[PDB]
Design a binder for this molecule. Structure first.
Ligand code: HEM
Ligand code: HEM
Length: 268
């Protein structure tokens, strides 16, 4: 018999699909949460709510034999309800680093009973990651000092919503050879003109999505304080798909390489 599997969390879903895809003789992926938009086969799974607002009744309506959940999956009441029904829920942490992605690969493969496919994916990943680390170490974007990057997850605002430390953005900026222009706070906050002028970003990074919630590139650089910054003076903007940039899944080597390439282009 085939296990019916639900996956909660975009990076976990990518990992599950990269091990084989929607179907193997051992398991079938039958549901996910709304953050699971990659690959195309994940985007097509029935969804049972946003990862932190799970419906236990919705999740159980798909009759799962196994749930693979990011440690961020919630609320705790819903996860308790699902385990209470005799469903195995196996939880995975989402630390913003490569070793957590590597442990995710082997841990997911082991939960789906596909250890040999996990070893093979991890071998590919390790190969790509060394290449990514080589490429970043070869050259600093801009070829001089490590540039200061401001990441804008959203802009509401009428200010930027921006990433401090202990975020996925901070780690990606650092893996790509740059420095976070925002210092002195953790997680995300709205941005002041006075903090932005202190940040003096050389490049502004923004979600492919969250470039709409400003009006586009030209509108973004018309935000107060942006114009006087080194980024705004040189009009250095880089947009990227949020889940690909920030997801910390099996595309991590490509995500780091890409961010590095974009920052190099921008700082030409
Ligand atoms: C609609 C598509 C959305 C996407 C793809 C998205 C994506 C993300 C991502 C990738 C992160 C982690 C980034 C990092 O660690 O650097 C994050 C954090 C967060 N997101 Fe979203 N988001 C979306 C909409 C929303 C909405 C509607 C809300 C709330 C009303 C929201 C609230 C948050 C909050 C509160 C955090 C944590 C902020 C903090 O650490 O202080 N997002 N989101
Ligand atoms: C890689 C990590 C994350 C991703 C990909 C992500 C993505 C998203 C997406 C796609 C939505 C909107 C779902 C929809 O309605 O279509 C959302 C909403 C939200 N996110 Fe997350 N997020 C992440 C991390 C976080 C974190 C760390 C927090 C809080 C600490 C957070 C808090 C919220 C909240 C409160 C909402 C509001 C729900 C809603 O308005 O529908 N997110 N996020």
């Amino acid at each position: 018999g085939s296990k019916r599997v639900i996956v909660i969390g975009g990076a976990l879903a990518e990992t599950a699909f990269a091990l084989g895809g929607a179907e193997t003789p051992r398991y079938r992926l039958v549901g996910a949460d709304t953050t699971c938009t990659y690959p195309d086969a994940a985007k097509r799974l029935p969804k049972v709510g946003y990862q932190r607002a799970l419906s236990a009744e919705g999740l159980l309506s798909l009759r799962p034999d196994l749930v693979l959940a990011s440690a961020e999956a919630g609320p705790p009441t819903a996860i308790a309800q699902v385990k209470g029904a005799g469903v195995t829920v196996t939880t995975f942490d989402e630390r913003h680093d490569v070793e957590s992605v590597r442990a995710k690969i082997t841990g997911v493969a082991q939960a789906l009973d596909v250890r040999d496919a996990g070893a093979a994916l991890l071998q590919r990943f390790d190969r790509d990651w060394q290449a990514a680390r080589d490429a970043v170490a070869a050259r600093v974007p801009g070829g001089a000092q490590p540039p200061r990057v401001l990441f804008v997850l959203n802009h509401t605002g009428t200010q930027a919503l921006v990433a401090g430390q202990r975020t996925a953005a901070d780690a990606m900026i650092r893996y790509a050879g740059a420095r976070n222009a925002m210092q002195g706070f953790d997680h995300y906050k709205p941005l002041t003109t006075e903090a932005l002028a202190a940040a003096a970003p050389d490049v502004v990074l923004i979600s492919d999505e969250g470039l709409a919630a400003v009006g586009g590139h030209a509108a973004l650089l018309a935000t107060p304080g942006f114009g006087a910054t080194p980024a705004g003076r040189a009009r250095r903007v880089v947009s990227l798909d949020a889940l690909f940039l920030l997801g910390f899944g099996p595309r991590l080597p490509l995500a780091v390489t890409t961010l590095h390439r974009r920052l190099s282009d921008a700082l030409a």
